Ligand binder design. Structure first.
Ligand SMILES: O=C(O)CNC(=O)C(=O)O
Ligand SMILES: [Mg+2]
Ligand code: NI
Ligand SMILES: [Zn+2]
Length: 331
């Protein structure tokens, strides 16, 4: 069995290997990359996502989210307070202000220590989940706006044509902006490209050990657990690496820098934080190996998780017994 310790693998494809996205994902899996839940892909040196980032300041962040924390430094929840719209240029200035800017630090490990010690005492503002793309239309390789759609994968694998679309989303981050512990909708893959700016630190639990994380989370968030049998679908809970280590949960960590892709694999729980002003782009995708994970994915039916239009068909076709109850949560 390849990669039996479930380490995060880093890949350096040549320009020739960067032509066929599906084929390269399958190659990474042949080497055991999926066992970690997360892989890093460094694009060939010839490749670029677009020519410059000099003209992005007029993108609108219609609903910036202030991420307010409750709990203790290593075990907390966050809620998202909606703020007034602002442009990317306004947001960048805000991120760089004395109130929100990255502190002085020695290296990524020192910054990680400062994040875990101090995150809860601040409420950073995240421009998340903005439909759109920063890939140039002429970028032919690994262009996250030109991937094969999950609807077409389901149709190719299973023969059933379904409604729905699959488009990318932009994330504009600042110091301490946080992504809570989660898997993807329907336990899909994700791919994330860090277009510009400061790094993003990721934490991930191997898919084969995801239920260990879920059991800890039920212990650490006991009211939330009673409220919903899949409350990590709410994307609000944080647990630090120190706490994970104290409770014996297998995980790994890695820092993504600008110009790098990360791939999350089906049922790979992940969480993380941004080091400073940055912009990422991400989208879900599927392969034939995902289908069995989609069929088994948990679902939130309490009403909190509220998701996209396109998840309807996935539930309806892959999970017909759950469909009725899940849809009641959606309506
Ligand atoms: O970058 C972020 O804030 C969160 N992104 C992801 O969870 C992803 O790409 O799957
Ligand atoms: Mg612009
Ligand atoms: Ni994710
Ligand atoms: Zn729920």
């Amino acid at each position: 069995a390849q990669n039996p310790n479930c380490n995060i693998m880093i890949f350096h494809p040549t320009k020739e290997e960067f032509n066929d996205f599906d084929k390269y994902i399958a190659y990474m899996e042949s080497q055991g990359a999926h066992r970690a839940g997360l892989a890093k892909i460094i694009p060939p040196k010839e490749w670029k996502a677009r020519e410059t980032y000099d003209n992005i300041s007029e993108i609108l962040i219609a609903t910036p989210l202030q991420q307010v924390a409750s709990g203790r430094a290593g075990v907390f929840t966050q809620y998202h307070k909606k703020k007034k719209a602002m442009t990317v240029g306004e947001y960048r200035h805000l991120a760089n202000s004395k109130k929100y800017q990255t502190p002085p630090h020695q290296n990524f490990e020192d910054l990680e220590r400062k994040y875990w010690k101090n995150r809860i005492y601040n409420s950073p503002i995240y421009g998340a989940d903005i439909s759109g793309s920063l890939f140039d239309e002429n970028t032919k390789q690994w262009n996250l706006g030109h991937l094969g759609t999950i609807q077409d994968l389901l149709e190719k694998e299973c023969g059933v044509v379904i409604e729905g679309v699959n488009t990318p989303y932009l994330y504009f981050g600042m110091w301490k902006t946080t992504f809570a512990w989660h898997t993807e909708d329907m336990d899909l893959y994700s791919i994330n490209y860090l277009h510009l700016g400061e790094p993003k630190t990721w934490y991930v639990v191997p898919p084969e050990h995801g239920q260990r994380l879920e059991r800890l989370a039920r212990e650490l968030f006991p009211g939330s657990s009673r409220g919903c049998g899949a409350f990590l679908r709410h994307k609000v809970a944080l647990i630090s690496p120190t706490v994970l280590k104290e409770n014996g949960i297998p995980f790994n960590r890695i820092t993504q820098e600008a110009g790098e892709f990360m791939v999350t694999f089906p049922y790979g729980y992940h969480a993380g934080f941004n080091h400073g002003f940055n912009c990422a782009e991400a989208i879900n995708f599927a392969t034939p190996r995902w289908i069995d994970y989609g069929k088994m994915a948990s679902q939130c039916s309490c009403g909190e998780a509220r998701v996209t239009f396109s998840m309807d068909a996935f539930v309806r076709i892959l999970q017909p017994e759950r469909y009725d109850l899940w849809k009641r949560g959606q309506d």
